[PDB]
């Protein structure tokens, strides 16, 4: 039973980074050379594990997280980073064991005159914990006065839309990202590389 990484990387629709998706992959085998020997990725960087050793290892569980961000924000998808994405949208732990994979998706996620459907969280009271998801749309209390659910002074809607236009510079183009987390708990391994 081949691991279903295909329906993550080749999915037709990707989610907004604030509402990043997660697929739990278990009880399967996979040849990871299909990924790290692919010419389709502009970023393929692993932490705590070398890509060329993935096929020698088994893990209790593997998570595959996916989302869309800007090109010059792919740097934030790494351990120990800061910024609106790492702080408020998708946060990797310091001791991350996994791989970050990204590729330019201007042809799929942009529209002449702007694609506006991809969003990110711009305001948040605190930084996300590692691997935390926050999809709430409560009004952000920028000051000390309660907002009571009302947009106004010091009370901001927390989400902001990317403006993905084909003519944007590369740093402002959309990039699809897949984060693979390899976890080894005190429990039977079930996901093995080949």
């Amino acid at each position, epitope marked *: 039973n081949l691991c279903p990484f295909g329906e993550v990387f080749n999915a037709t629709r990707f989610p907004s980074v604030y509402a990043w998706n997660r697929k739990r992959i278990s009880n399967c085998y996979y040849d990871y050379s299909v990924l790290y020997n692919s010419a389709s990725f502009s970023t393929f960087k692993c932490y705590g594990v070398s890509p060329t050793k993935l096929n020698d290892l088994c893990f209790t569980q593997v998570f595959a997280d996916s989302f869309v961000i800007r090109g010059d924000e792919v740097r934030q998808i790494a351990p120990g980073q800061t910024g609106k994405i790492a702080d408020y949208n998708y946060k990797l732990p310091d001791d991350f064991t996994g791989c970050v994979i990204a590729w330019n998706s201007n042809n799929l996620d942009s529209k002449v005159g702007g694609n*506006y459907n991809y969003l990110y969280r711009l305001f948040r009271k605190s930084n996300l914990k590692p691997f935390e998801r926050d999809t709430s749309t409560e009004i952000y209390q920028a000051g000390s006065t309660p907002c009571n659910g009302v*947009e106004g002074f010091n009370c901001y*809607f927390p989400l902001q839309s990317y403006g993905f236009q084909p003519t944007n510079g590369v740093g402002y183009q959309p990039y699809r990202v897949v984060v693979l987390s390899f976890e080894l708990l005190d429990a039977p391994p079930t996901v093995c590389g080949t």
Partner: single-chain antibody, 241 residues
Framework: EVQLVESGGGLIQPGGSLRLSCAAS????????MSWVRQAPGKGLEWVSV???????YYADSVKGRFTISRDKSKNTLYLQMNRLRAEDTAVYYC?????????????????????????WGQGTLVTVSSSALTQPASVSGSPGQSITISCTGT?????????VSWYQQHPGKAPKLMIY???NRPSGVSNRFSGSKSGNTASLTISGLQAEDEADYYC??????????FGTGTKVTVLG
């Protein structure tokens, strides 16, 4: 390249309905607070409605229960539905955008949606229906190369409650142009001859080295404690000679 292009104006009978459109480009209509501002023939600017990033809408009492502001994000378009129309609604209608979350790119001020100044305007569309305000002096004049000052009194609830006073220049037949924001700040590209200040409930615009091109109508505007906006009555600046 930010642009706001309006359409839908026309002559309609009292009691009729009309929908105005404001097609935006260069930015996402949901990423900025969008307002409609109208101007009756020969009169001053009147703010009437705004829509916030989360969809919240606020209205001037003069249009409550009759006008509805909305947007279509797929069309990047802002709308004003005008029902139960009155002859007093005859005016040029402008759509206007408020500031970017980052403010201006040449100065670090963090991120905030408290950016209360109309930095980009549509060209205006006239609606003819045919079968309050901050205090400004009616007219001010000065000699070429000299300085004049324009006052703008409000209340604890707007000019004197916040440092969110902005000033606009309007030539005949043209949309207003932002000259000063946040009381004393100048956008890039606006002449250093324009400056702004405030004391108590009165804001002031000073134009130095007056030139013939400075002849125009000038309006102040303020955020209000009701999350609305309010324009001054307008000042006609005359450059002698």
């Amino acid at each position: 390249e930010v642009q706001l292009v309006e359409s839908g104006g026309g002559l309609i009978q009292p009691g009729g309905s009309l929908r105005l459109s404001c097609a935006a480009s260069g930015f996402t209509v949901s990423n900025n607070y969008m307002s409609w501002v109208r101007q009756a023939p020969g009169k001053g600017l009147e703010w009437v409605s705004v829509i916030y990033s989360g969809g919240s809408t606020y209205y001037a009492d003069s249009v409550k229960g009759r006008f509805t502001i909305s947007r279509d994000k797929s069309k990047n378009t802002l709308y004003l539905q005008m029902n139960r129309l009155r002859a007093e609604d005859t005016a040029v209608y402008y759509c206007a955008r408020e500031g970017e979350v980052e403010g201006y790119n040449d100065f670090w001020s963090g991120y905030s949606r408290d950016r209360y100044y109309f930095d980009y305007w549509g060209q205006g569309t006239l609606v003819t229906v045919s079968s309050s305000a901050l205090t400004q002096p009616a007219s001010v004049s000065g000699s070429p190369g000299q300085s004049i000052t324009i006052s703008c009194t409000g209340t604890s609830s707007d000019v004197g409650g916040y440092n969110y006073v902005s000033w606009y220049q309007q030539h005949p037949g043209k949309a207003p142009k932002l000259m000063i924001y946040d009381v004393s700040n100048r956008p890039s590209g606006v002449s250093n001859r324009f400056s702004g200040s405030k004391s108590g409930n009165t804001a002031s615009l000073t134009i130095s080295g007056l030139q013939a091109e400075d002849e125009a109508d000038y309006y102040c505007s303020s955020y209000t404690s009701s999350s609305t906006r309010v324009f001054g009555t307008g000042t006609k600046v005359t450059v002698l000679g």
